[PDB]
């Protein structure tokens, strides 16, 4: 009938009320001051507030406030001021606590959705989620948490229904408690599954284009690949893409091969062309394959691993693209130590610098011819420096994904500490709604009910341990 009455649940030795009270005061004030510190840091910094991906932290901090103040005020409303609690204020406090927990769960939900978008769909993260979509989503999350918190005040209490009534908390019924615990539990299960799937899929997909998956040296790999195609050892060139006119300049490559066919150095060259598309270009490539004995054309669909090996074996990769927005082929080539010879247009203009690879103008077979000749000239010397520089640059463009994975790991840590802190309490609520309700379980509930405040204590501690940008903003504040 009274909120936060320790003597109701367990008999406490009268020698340590002062110690319990002062510990509760220190913990509550520490939580409140550190949460306001987190809000001040996250709001006074332009860099963090302009990033939607960190928004959840603020939301969590707000939730960390909502469960904290309602704690300490309820200590003031009972101990130092001996006023009793009516039905309305008790339901208000219970709604505040439940709103804090539901807001934490929903913030983790929006954070998981954002993590999936940012990690596994990187080409859409910039343009799907922005300021208005994220702020609207967080607003609806907070409002739905608020309304499920407020539902018992509208007439879903134990008094009005006159039904079977809960024992662990008065003035509420079993049906509302079951509904709230069910939606929270199914949400948390979905979060666990989603974060496990995100961390599993991104583990193999991100670290896939590394040279650690290839066995043997580059020279013997190239020799084995060329012997598989029935060709002699030489400087190898690779093209992989789409057989069409306008998107990828494969016709430019074929014209360049025809131009080099008139020279004496063509017999040293080896050419591999992989693609599928217009039958005219396919027939043209087949005619060049039948004419010269150092040109191989592959049309059937290739697996990912096979193409990984091909990048690992060839010496140069030709990308004569007319319009290449993202330059993914260059990134995959340089991740596996292949020098790219690409047209200076689109992303290929700024992925490849003048030192890493060779850049030509778009649509000129002559410039491509001179570039291939210069590549063969450079192949006389050692190309290990080019390989290492291309690998370094390609790994440099992948730095965003690793930070996204680190943020996902921080979110997983937040979720698991939430689960650890709210496990026994949720299980005790399950035991209350389903089955009997004895005094020992009441004492266990009273003991583990401090884990919510401990959870609110430890949530902003790990932000400093994980978020470097939050530390930078805090240092800039001082």
């Amino acid at each position: 009938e009274n909120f936060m009455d320790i003597e109701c649940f367990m008999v406490l030795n009268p020698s340590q009320q002062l110690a319990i009270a002062v510990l509760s005061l220190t913990l509550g004030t520490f939580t409140v001051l550190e949460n306001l510190l987190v809000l001040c840091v996250i709001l006074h910094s332009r860099s963090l507030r302009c990033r939607p991906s960190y928004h959840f932290i603020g939301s969590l901090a707000v939730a960390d406030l909502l469960g904290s103040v309602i704690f300490v005020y309820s200590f003031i409303d009972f101990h130092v001021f001996h006023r009793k609690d009516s039905r309305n204020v008790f339901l208000f406090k219970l709604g505040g606590v439940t709103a804090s927990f539901t807001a934490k769960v929903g913030s983790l939900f929006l954070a998981a959705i954002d993590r999936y978008i940012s990690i596994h769909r990187p080409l859409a993260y910039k343009r799907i989620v922005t300021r208005p979509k994220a702020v609207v989503a967080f607003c609806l999350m907070w409002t739905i948490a608020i309304v499920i918190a407020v539902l018992p005040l509208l007439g879903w209490n134990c008094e009005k229904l006159q039904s079977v009534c809960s024992d662990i908390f008065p003035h509420i019924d079993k049906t509302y408690l079951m509904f709230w615990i069910g939606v929270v539990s199914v949400l948390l299960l979905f979060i666990v599954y989603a974060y496990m799937y995100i961390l599993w899929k991104a583990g193999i997909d991100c670290s896939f284009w590394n040279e650690s998956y290839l066995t043997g040296s580059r020279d013997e790999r190239k020799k084995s690949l060329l012997s598989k195609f029935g060709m002699d050892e030489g400087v190898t060139f690779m093209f992989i893409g789409r057989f069409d006119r306008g998107q990828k300049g494969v016709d430019v490559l074929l014209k360049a091969i025809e131009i080099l066919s008139s020279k004496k150095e063509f017999q040293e060259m080896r050419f591999i062309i992989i693609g599928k598309g217009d039958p005219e270009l396919e027939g043209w490539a087949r005619s060049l394959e039948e004419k010269h004995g150092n040109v191989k054309v592959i049309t059937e669909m290739l697996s990912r691993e096979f193409v990984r090996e091909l990048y690992g074996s060839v010496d140069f990769v030709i990308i004569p693209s007319y319009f290449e927005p993202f330059g993914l082929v260059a990134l995959e080539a340089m991740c596996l130590g292949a020098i790219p010879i690409a047209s200076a247009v689109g992303g290929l203009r700024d992925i490849i610098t003048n030192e890493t690879g060779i850049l030509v103008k778009a649509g000129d077979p002559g410039e491509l011819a001179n570039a291939i000749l210069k590549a063969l000239e450079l192949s006389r010397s050692d190309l290990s420096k080019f390989r290492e520089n291309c690998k370094k640059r390609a790994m440099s463009f992948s730095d965003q994904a690793r930070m996204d994975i680190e943020l996902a790991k921080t979110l997983v840590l937040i979720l698991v500490v939430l689960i650890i802190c709210w496990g026994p309490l949720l299980a005790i609520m399950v035991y209350d709604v389903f089955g009997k309700m004895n005094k020992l379980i009441k004492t266990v509930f009273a003991f583990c009910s401090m884990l919510c405040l401990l959870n609110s204590t430890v949530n902003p501690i790990i932000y400093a341990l994980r978020s470097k940008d939050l530390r930078h903003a805090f240092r800039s504040m001082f």
Partner: nanobody, 121 residues
Framework: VQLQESGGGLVQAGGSLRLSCAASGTIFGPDVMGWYRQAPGKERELVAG???????YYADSVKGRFTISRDNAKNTVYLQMNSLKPEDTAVYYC????????????????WGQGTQVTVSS
């Protein structure tokens, strides 16, 4: 995904014209938008292309005359041409490419219905 065109019709030489292509997908819909044109007795060719922002590409015969833009409020692509030439009479299609990040060779191309545009001197 579903692709719809609008804005087709005849126009006099030296005029102006707009086409709008709308896409309906599940996640971000298309990744790369483009316009292709096909003259009678002539294979289809890429008039213009866009991914996002100022990362555009125009065919060498229409540079400085055509322009292309993208809108995220309705996830559409807008093609503007000014000072029409009488060799621009063709059927126009909007092409949507969804390409996978993990392995660049895989891609999905979707073609719309297309509209007939005739330029009269």
């Amino acid at each position: 995904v579903q692709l719809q065109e609008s804005g087709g019709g005849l126009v006099q030489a030296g005029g102006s014209l707009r086409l709008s292509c709308a896409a309906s997908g599940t996640i971000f819909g298309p990744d790369v938008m483009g316009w292709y044109r096909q003259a009678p007795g002539k294979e289809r060719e890429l008039v213009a292309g866009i991914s996002n922002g100022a990362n555009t590409y125009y065919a060498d015969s229409v540079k400085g005359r055509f322009t292309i833009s993208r809108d995220n409020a309705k996830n559409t692509v807008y093609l503007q041409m000014n000072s029409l030439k009488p060799e621009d009479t063709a059927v126009y299609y909007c092409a949507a490419e969804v390409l996978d990040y993990t392995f660049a060779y895989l891609y999905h191309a979707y073609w719309g219905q297309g509209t007939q545009v005739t330029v009269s001197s």
